[PDB]
């Protein structure tokens, strides 16, 4: 699926940052985009499970209102192997909102395990400083 993160950002407290990942080699609208972060002082925290097909989003209580999640319309490069992008904006960043952020493709389209992170991107660094 070659999920590729656009890159790192080095922001200041109170700034807004848009973090984005691109896809190449799978049907973008078939699987969820999972936003997860790993923080040096906490470890993996998770962030949200956003569907690129519908508008449905499942956002952690910890991050409701703080972060706005959205996806782009897929570009049909070839049948069964499309491209596209998704991104999220985290508002009012705190010193705790540092570390490495990941994008992930969902495992299955149906079944009890759907929306679960399966294919993870390279990840990007955020210093909030």
């Amino acid at each position: 699926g070659q999920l590729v993160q656009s890159g790192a950002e080095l922001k200041k407290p109170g700034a807004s940052v848009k973090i984005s990942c691109k896809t190449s080699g799978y049907r973008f609208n078939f699987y969820h985009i999972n936003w997860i972060r790993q923080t040096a002082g906490r470890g993996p925290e998770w962030m949200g499970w956003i569907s690129p097909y519908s508008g449905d989003k499942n956002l952690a209580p910890a991050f409701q209102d703080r972060v706005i999640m959205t996806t782009d319309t897929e570009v049909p490069v070839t049948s069964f192997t499309s491209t596209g992008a998704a991104y999220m904006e985290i508002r009012n960043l705190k010193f705790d909102d540092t570390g490495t952020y990941f994008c992930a493709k969902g495992l299955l389209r149906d079944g009890s395990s759907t929306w679960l992170p399966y294919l993870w991107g390279q990840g990007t660094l955020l210093t909030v400083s």
Binding site: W46, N58, F102, S112, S113, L116, P117, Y118, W120
Partner: protein, 112 residues
């Protein structure tokens, strides 16, 4: 956090090791599914077991798992040096996000 592990487990090369996950009733194993992930520091995670015992594609049969009413277990047979990385288990349902617990490191004994 809410979902916790033993923080550190160990075992010898060629033998088996068990990693357990426990937690409060809000993460009770009787209602929520437990997934497992290999999470080396600084590198992308790899999915191992999406649902208590369902093995992810490409994962050697030496990885397996089981669940008990009060806990969830990952069994790693024939430990290899690459298994030294920290493993994490996060619980979930089909209509709720996966909640991640603390990690467990693995010490692979008998190396040069």
């Amino acid at each position: 956090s809410v979902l916790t592990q033993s923080a550190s487990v160990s075992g010898s090369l060629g033998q088996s090791v068990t990693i357990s996950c426990t937690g409060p009733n809000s993460v009770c194993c009787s209602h929520k599914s437990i997934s497992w992930y290999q999470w080396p520091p600084g590198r992308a995670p790899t999915l191992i077991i999406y649902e208590d015992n369902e093995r992810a594609p490409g994962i050697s049969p030496r990885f397996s798992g089981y669940k008990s009413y009060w806990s969830a277990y990952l069994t790693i047979s024939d430990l290899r040096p690459e298994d030294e990385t920290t493993y994490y288990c996060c619980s979930y349902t089909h209509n709720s996000g996966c909640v991640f617990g603390t990690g467990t490191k693995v010490s692979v004994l008998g190396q040069s």
